[PDB]
Amino acid sequence: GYDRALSIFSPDGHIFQVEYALEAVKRGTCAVGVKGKNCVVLGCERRSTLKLQDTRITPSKVSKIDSHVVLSFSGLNADSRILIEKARVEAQSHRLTLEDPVTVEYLTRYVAGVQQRYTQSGGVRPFGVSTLIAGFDPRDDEPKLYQTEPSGIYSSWSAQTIGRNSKTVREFLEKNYDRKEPPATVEECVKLTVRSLLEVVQTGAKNIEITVVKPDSDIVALSSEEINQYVTQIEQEKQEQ
Amino acid sequence: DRGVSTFSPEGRLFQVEYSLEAIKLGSTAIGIATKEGVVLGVEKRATSPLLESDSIEKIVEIDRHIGCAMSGLTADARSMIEHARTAAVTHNLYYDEDINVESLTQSVCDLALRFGEEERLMSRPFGVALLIAGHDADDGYQLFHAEPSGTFYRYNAKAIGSGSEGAQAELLNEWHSSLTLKEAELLVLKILKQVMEEKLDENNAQLSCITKQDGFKIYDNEKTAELIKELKEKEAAE
Amino acid sequence: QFNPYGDNGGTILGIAGEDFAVLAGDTRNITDYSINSRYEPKVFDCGDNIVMSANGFAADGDALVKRFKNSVKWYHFDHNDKKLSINSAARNIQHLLYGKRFFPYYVHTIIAGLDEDGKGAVYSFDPVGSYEREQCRAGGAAASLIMPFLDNQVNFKNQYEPGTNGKVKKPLKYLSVEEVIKLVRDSFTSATERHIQVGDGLEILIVTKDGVRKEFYELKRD
Amino acid sequence: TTTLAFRFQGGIIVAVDSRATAGNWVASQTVKKVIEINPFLLGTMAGGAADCQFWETWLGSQCRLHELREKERISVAAASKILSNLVYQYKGAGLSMGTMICGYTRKEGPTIYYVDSDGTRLKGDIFCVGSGQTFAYGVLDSNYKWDLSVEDALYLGKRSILAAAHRDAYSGGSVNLYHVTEDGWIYHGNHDVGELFWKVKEEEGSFNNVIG
Amino acid sequence: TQQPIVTGTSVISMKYDNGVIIAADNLGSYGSLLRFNGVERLIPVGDNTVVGISGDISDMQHIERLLKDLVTENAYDNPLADAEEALEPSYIFEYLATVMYQRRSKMNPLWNAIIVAGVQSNGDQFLRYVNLLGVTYSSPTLATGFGAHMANPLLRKVVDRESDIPKTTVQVAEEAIVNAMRVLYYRDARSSRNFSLAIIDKNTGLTFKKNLQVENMKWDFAKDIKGYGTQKI
Amino acid sequence: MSVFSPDGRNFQVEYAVKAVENGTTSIGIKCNDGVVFAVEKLITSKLLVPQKNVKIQVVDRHIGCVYSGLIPDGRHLVNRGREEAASFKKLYKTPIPIPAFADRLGQYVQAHTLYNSVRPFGVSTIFGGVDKNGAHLYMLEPSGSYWGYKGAATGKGRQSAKAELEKLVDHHPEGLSAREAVKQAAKIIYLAHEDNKEKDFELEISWCSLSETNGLHKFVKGDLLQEAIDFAQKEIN
Amino acid sequence: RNNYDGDTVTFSPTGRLFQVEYALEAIKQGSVTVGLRSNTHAVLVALKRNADELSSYQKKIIKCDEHMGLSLAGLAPDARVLSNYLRQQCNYSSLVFNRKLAVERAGHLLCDKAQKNTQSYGGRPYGVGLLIIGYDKSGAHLLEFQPSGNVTELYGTAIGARSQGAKTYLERTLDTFIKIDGNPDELIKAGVEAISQSLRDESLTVDNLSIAIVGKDTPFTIYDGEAVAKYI
Amino acid sequence: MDIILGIRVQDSVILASSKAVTRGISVLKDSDDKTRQLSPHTLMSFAGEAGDTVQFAEYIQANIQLYSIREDYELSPQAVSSFVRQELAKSIRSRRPYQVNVLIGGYDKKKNKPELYQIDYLGTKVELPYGAHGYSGFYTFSLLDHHYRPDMTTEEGLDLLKLCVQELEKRMPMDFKGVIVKIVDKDGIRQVDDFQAQ
Amino acid sequence: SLGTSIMAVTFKDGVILGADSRTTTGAYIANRVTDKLTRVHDKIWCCRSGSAADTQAIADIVQYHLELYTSQYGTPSTETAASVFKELCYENKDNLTAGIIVAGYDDKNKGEVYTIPLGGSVHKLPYAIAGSGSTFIYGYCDKNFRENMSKEETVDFIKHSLSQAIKWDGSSGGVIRMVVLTAAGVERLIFYPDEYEQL
């Protein structure tokens, strides 16, 4: 019975609840994504460490929607769980009726669809979540990366980041990413991604996690040491200069 | 605070008026009608270079004989297209014929005032406007402006968004009873080039038409690119 | 148990000409061996140069006619007084009939008029909405006694030019509105003799670009 | 009723008859049993005339919406499933249909799905459905080669409907032929059975025991 | 769904030069038990319409009470209730016919056979039939139950067709009816001797006659009929 | 609404009363075998069709109602009135007794003062008729309060009228034949028109009497309406 | 006003529904339209507004049945919602009673449908004014409908901005037009003049002007453009 | 019914499943695969009422795949059956009951054991060494009871099935157009494509 | 079920209801002393026939209605009471087997009798007879009923008419009950076999 209109216009023409919802995304731990010639990479900052937490079981920022698509987010963790569940269902329902998994643009659209319905339905507030959704369409090699906001607006990106200090790292990438010369290798790509975060992280491989998505449902999460080979390399490369 | 479907003392709906304010902030979009077709064009406005400039669709197909361009909180327009597309296909199914463009528009507009607290589950009005352009065999080529106020108007040409008054004025002057399709294509391009902050090019602008002949087509970045350099040359000489 | 259906008999006929079309039905409404009315009209002008008849269980037929007429009326309100094309009308009816797919309208229904090129058009339906544009169609009690006749005198089926060996069929020439009317009456007077549910009267509705005109012929009352 | 449809290097041949009876009463022989769902897709009619026609016409409306939302041609796999899944919602309520959903997409080649009102959905190469089916499968199974020329395939198809139209009381009128290519279907016309029969017995020498 | 229990029998009618005449016996049968003899099955609405009803009486009683409410409600916020905007036969009928059809359609019929006789604002004779299935029809003569089979043959010989209506007078037509009522009393085991009759006329208006009887019968030949074949006494 | 102010009253009702007071006057007079209803209809313009904006409503066949205040609310109440009078009858057979009816409205109006998401009625309704045992005149405030009456009036010229009524009660304790009450009311509408005499006004009178209307409710029209208008014009001039 | 005009379910200390009054303002700022009638016809003349020279003129007239239709001023969508409601009642009265709906009665209904929005919470009062004409079993009729729930029957009247001028001209013309019985084109001119009296800035022409008439033998029809040229 | 056979050997689980689909008088398809892969190490053969049969299997598969992804884990071949049984239990007092019979053949990677489960349309689950649905057991069980050995090599399993299929081909009236055979083991699910004249 | 032998006769001072006493299920007499006279209001009673379960559940629900009615509109007419019975019997024709006679006393109307047979129809009458045993006394009752009878005469008329019904109808038997309704209150009578058989 509770349908009070929580998301509403104000004289200037804004819906303050959608904006306060972005304010919550700017609070979140940074998230970034970049696509190479033949791969897509996702990076994510994580507070400190922390010397007394348990990492194996505790929710890791990158989630799998299907075997060929993943999702990353900044903002309210509790909220993102809701978008991940719904998204994972629409994935398997798509398979069940269309006999083909989702395209990255289709899934991305569905999520942004939810995000929007919560800016226009009564008794509910928008999601304090913005996302990077990345993968490969089935029987396709060309890489895909998309971003969705609490507005319900979505769009594709060669590189993008969201969350705290996102502005710094977008400015970094706006300089360090050539549309004509996109990171030809996995390695070449994972490097740029580790570096984009190293403006905002304040330590090496402790906070950074990387997930590498390559065609035909090929996804792997780099374990700290491999990330620390890019960290070891980046601090001495900048040095010489 | 004070209710959603509340009236001001001037007899306006605060929300519908505050909705229109959100539209003024939207990307520009122009539409021009002719005896040869209707042309719609838009300003993509990519907030960063990195953003893949063609995943920005502000012109969509509603049916083979109807297209529509949008301005403002574009996210809100998803529901409206979905309904418009359904409405048009449904009608085809019940009558084995195309829906008249007015009818299609009037259906979209109904949707717009269904908000509040029939069975109007929707908390606020849409925060987006639509130019709707198509062709039926009764009233040939047509353009409509569909506000979140539920009202629509037919236009021989019209702009919505950031540069609308400057472009409407410029449209008032430039539009004549007998422009060709290609003249109209150019005025859209010209008038967009005036009001857009950026230097109009094939990646921050898109152009489309709807002819009785081939229905609704969105001009690919190549074809529009040639029309831009067709302007620079048409303008250069006087 | 209560049976919700019944049969009021009657026979109806639809024929399409080059620039015209007819929809004729007998006038006699019945129940078993009783006559309910020697004059109860079965064919209706529904506006937009559409005529129709829903033969069979006249209650379900009345219901159906009322609905379609009203569908027209709303098509005008809802779509800026646009004229309802005969095909568009045929489609609408399929939706009406199929709405009651699991509790059918107990009727065989037919409409006539002119397509959008002004050519004579007839459509025939199922009780559940299967429709097909037709050239010539009888429906009702006597439909069996009429169809073979028309196949023969309208479509010249089984005829050949004399001395042709049986190798060259009769030319399929285009009939008038007045040769068609002869066949319509000759069909109904023939049926009248062999079917106990066909008699009294024969009212015909003719549709040409000039509009919807009507004619009526007395029929044997036994 | 005799409906059939096969897959070959040239795509798909589809062929049906025209007769519709009400017991022993031949009500019409001018019945479209090939449903032109849309320019790339076809469906045959067996069992419920309205049921097939109505629901497949609807399929066309569902396939349109799909293309609008995904800016892409619908797979035959997914268009058949739409019809199938709907039908399954109504299972037990009396719907009658036995139809082939035919189409040729870039992605999947020429595909044919059988969908009946029991919910059954099956991908196949050759399907005949109806009162004439047993007859048509005989002719079909004898001359079926993946390498029939478009032109023979059309004939094998037409001939099969003829074979059934002849024996089946319930099949007759004419034959409607269709050739489905990746670029869409092409109507290969109507053929009065009466006339076809004679012509065919003379070209082929078959129907020997039929005096004439 | 249901089945009739207390039932009304033949309701007959026809039209003449100025108006219409309708009649129905005054019996509420209970199977073969002739249980209730004071039943009026003629229900007058306005001064211009009369509704004859056959079938389930429980149901009739309900129709009757719908008709009172129709009048009641027609007057509401209607300053011309008893004038231009008075209930017209065409209106009263369409309403019932609507209700009867809706009812068969909810598989829950009003188990009746109704005849609505009357005269319209512009002098026109109105007379139409409607029953449990929603089937509606009209003709110069209309009857239900046995009347359909016995009364019509007779009444039709007076008004065989439309042209005949101007030639039939009220005395010619009223005698036809009174005869048919007799013939039905002779040959319908579910009939009553007492009946009511009503005339709606464009000049005389509505005249409603209760407590009639079938008179001038012939039973004298009976005394001579003996045995069933060869018996002589 | 449904909020007591610290004084025990409900301010929203109290304001709905203001609306009523802003209203045209209407009255009721009980007579010895029925009741009479009367109302002033202001002529806003010479464009109103005289005798065509009838404000007195009939309930069932034997009850009349008249109101002052928010005309639409009034109808909305008479609509519930009709629904209620049909219900009662359908089940109980008899046409609804007046006092029973008065409570049916009294419970429903009062219902609209119990919730703060529903506004109370903006009319004061005068109604009444003839039942199984006598005549009854009732008047019903937005409060849901209602009582039987010898005479009643509500609206702008409510006292001008209550004064004229208090006299008829005193100077006529024997009774007051319907016909007399019709004229007497007409006079009271003319006198009460003094307060709100800016505009010209149209008279409207209905009556329900066992002898004159056989128990049914009817609109005093034509001749008998002229006598009434005459009778009144004499005691103004 | 602060508290009392926040919603419709609230009476001001002076007994007023402020939202209702505010919705009347939209009418007063609505483009003028006029109604007037005789004994044989009833006419609606309506001035149309436009947003631009490139804009169309928004229709102020809607048909409701074969023998009835109306004219508006205020919010268009609310006219649509009410004229659609009205289309169904006429239709219901036809379908079920084979009876044409009486003009008077349509007024009662639109009055009751509007009144519920002035009493219920969550809902706003309608924001549109309407003039309705029709030839029913008792002749020609004109009604003035107000969002408040107040419908009134008249010979003539006007609503919209500046409508006061045309209304006064009708108070005068009264005894003349009442009697334009049997004359269609004369009743239209009489209405067309009335409309001029509340005109001011511009001057009626083909695109502006819209006219409707119903009557004894004339089914309700609308005329716009070339078809109204004959009266300018 | 069609032939649904199942046999649990030492290292794996073999599932046979006829290739004929018949509608009334004509055999519509001679190459059907009455099986759905629910999870890398879990296969489900099915037989019964037309339409229901697949709707169910695809519906189950979807939920397992959804589960698999939500917990990035593979459910135990036991768990899966317990879920599948629960769904058939619901179907039984349902408005219209699914009339589908199944066999779950899985390889539990935790216990490193192959498991076979047969569950009828009523939701009657029992875990076996060799199972069968419908009349299939009537011909075959006499043979399996005799020759079956819990320590058999997969090839011994396939040999025992071959002998089962032959008897089905000899004494059973319906011509089921041969069987499709698949093995579920620690490495996954694969189809013995050479079960013709082995 | 009450199958039954019941009647209600209006006379000069008011009305008398009468009924047998036997309720059978098959041939076994479940209860041979049933009070088939049921009170829905002080001076408005009914006699029940057809399904006990039903007739009781109904009488009970009518009583309730008449009690609430009484609380707010004062006393109800025998007519208003009959109406309530019928509204229930008619609006539920499909699930009821009840044939009820309604009898009451208004001071204005004196005796009134309304019969409500299976359909749910209503018929007001001078007297009424119902139940299994009423088919046998149609002849007798009609021949001997007389309007405005003495109370003594009306009791005889009922006692005779019922004695006959009991005689022939196996489904009816026992004692003969009667309820008298006049301005002088409510009287309850009873006649044993040894008495009514000897007529």
Swiss-Prot record, chain B:
This is Proteasome subunit alpha type-5. GO terms for cellular component: nucleus; proteasome complex; proteasome core complex, alpha-subunit complex; proteasome storage granule. Keywords: Cytoplasm, Nucleus, Phosphoprotein, Proteasome. Present with 17100 molecules/cell in log phase SD medium. It is found in: Cytoplasm; Nucleus. The 26S proteasome consists of a 20S proteasome core and two 19S regulatory subunits. The 20S proteasome core is composed of 28 subunits that are arranged in four stacked rings, resulting in a barrel-shaped structure. The two end rings are each formed by seven alpha subunits, and the two central rings are each formed by seven beta subunits. The catalytic chamber with the active sites is on the inside of the barrel. Its main location: cytoplasm. The proteasome degrades poly-ubiquitinated proteins in the cytoplasm and in the nucleus. It is essential for the regulated turnover of proteins and for the removal of misfolded proteins. The proteasome is a multicatalytic proteinase complex that is characterized by its ability to cleave peptides with Arg, Phe, Tyr, Leu, and Glu adjacent to the leaving group at neutral or slightly basic pH. It has an ATP-dependent proteolytic activity. SUPFAM superfamilies: N-terminal nucleophile aminohydrolases (Ntn hydrolases) (SSF56235). NCBIfam families: PRK03996.1 (NF003075). It holds the Pfam family Proteasome. The modification Phosphoserine is found at S48. The modification Phosphothreonine is found at T47. SMART domains: Proteasome_A_N.
From Swiss-Prot, chain D:
The chain holds residues 76 to 287 of 287 of the full protein. This is Proteasome subunit beta type-5. The keyword NADP does not apply. The 26S proteasome consists of a 20S proteasome core and two 19S regulatory subunits. The 20S proteasome core is composed of 28 subunits that are arranged in four stacked rings, resulting in a barrel-shaped structure. The two end rings are each formed by seven alpha subunits, and the two central rings are each formed by seven beta subunits. The catalytic chamber with the active sites is on the inside of the barrel. The side chain of Thr-1 acts as a nucleophile, and the N-terminal amino group acts as a proton acceptor. Present with 8530 molecules/cell in log phase SD medium. It comes from the Eukaryota. Its EC number is 3.4.25.1. GO terms for molecular function: endopeptidase activity; threonine-type endopeptidase activity. It comes from Saccharomyces cerevisiae (strain ATCC 204508 / S288c) (Baker's yeast). Signal peptide: none annotated. Its main location: cytoplasm. It is found in: Cytoplasm; Nucleus. Keywords: Cytoplasm, Hydrolase, Nucleus, Protease, Proteasome, Threonine protease, Zymogen. The keyword Protease applies. Bortezomib binds at A49. One of its GO terms (cellular component) is proteasome complex. GO terms for biological process: proteasomal ubiquitin-independent protein catabolic process; proteasome core complex assembly; proteasome-mediated ubiquitin-dependent protein catabolic process. The active site is at T1. Belongs to the peptidase T1B family. It catalyses: Cleavage of peptide bonds with very broad specificity.
UniProtKB/Swiss-Prot annotation, chain F:
It comes from Saccharomyces cerevisiae (strain ATCC 204508 / S288c) (Baker's yeast). The chain holds residues 13 to 248 of 288 of the full protein. The alpha and beta forms are probably products of the same gene with different post-translational modifications. This is Probable proteasome subunit alpha type-7. The proteasome degrades poly-ubiquitinated proteins in the cytoplasm and in the nucleus. It is essential for the regulated turnover of proteins and for the removal of misfolded proteins. The proteasome is a multicatalytic proteinase complex that is characterized by its ability to cleave peptides with Arg, Phe, Tyr, Leu, and Glu adjacent to the leaving group at neutral or slightly basic pH. It has an ATP-dependent proteolytic activity. The keyword Nucleus applies. Belongs to the peptidase T1A family. Keywords: Acetylation, Cytoplasm, Nucleus, Proteasome. Present with 12000 molecules/cell in log phase SD medium. The keyword Repeat does not apply. GO terms for cellular component: nucleus; proteasome complex; proteasome core complex, alpha-subunit complex; proteasome storage granule. GO terms for biological process: proteasomal ubiquitin-independent protein catabolic process; proteasome-mediated ubiquitin-dependent protein catabolic process.
Swiss-Prot record, chain G:
There is a cross-link at K189 (Glycyl lysine isopeptide (Lys-Gly) (interchain with G-Cter in ubiquitin)). InterPro entries: Ntn_hydrolases_N, Proteasome_alpha, Proteasome_alpha-type, Proteasome_asu_N, Proteasome_sua/b. Keywords: Cytoplasm, Isopeptide bond, Nucleus, Phosphoprotein, Proteasome, Ubl conjugation. Pfam families: Proteasome, Proteasome_A_N. The proteasome degrades poly-ubiquitinated proteins in the cytoplasm and in the nucleus. It is essential for the regulated turnover of proteins and for the removal of misfolded proteins. The proteasome is a multicatalytic proteinase complex that is characterized by its ability to cleave peptides with Arg, Phe, Tyr, Leu, and Glu adjacent to the leaving group at neutral or slightly basic pH. It has an ATP-dependent proteolytic activity. It comes from Saccharomyces cerevisiae (strain ATCC 204508 / S288c). It is found in: Cytoplasm; Nucleus. The 26S proteasome consists of a 20S proteasome core and two 19S regulatory subunits. The 20S proteasome core is composed of 28 subunits that are arranged in four stacked rings, resulting in a barrel-shaped structure. The two end rings are each formed by seven alpha subunits, and the two central rings are each formed by seven beta subunits. The catalytic chamber with the active sites is on the inside of the barrel. This is Proteasome subunit alpha type-6. One of its GO terms (cellular component) is proteasome core complex, alpha-subunit complex. Belongs to the peptidase T1A family. Disulfide bonds: none annotated. The modification Phosphoserine is found at S12.
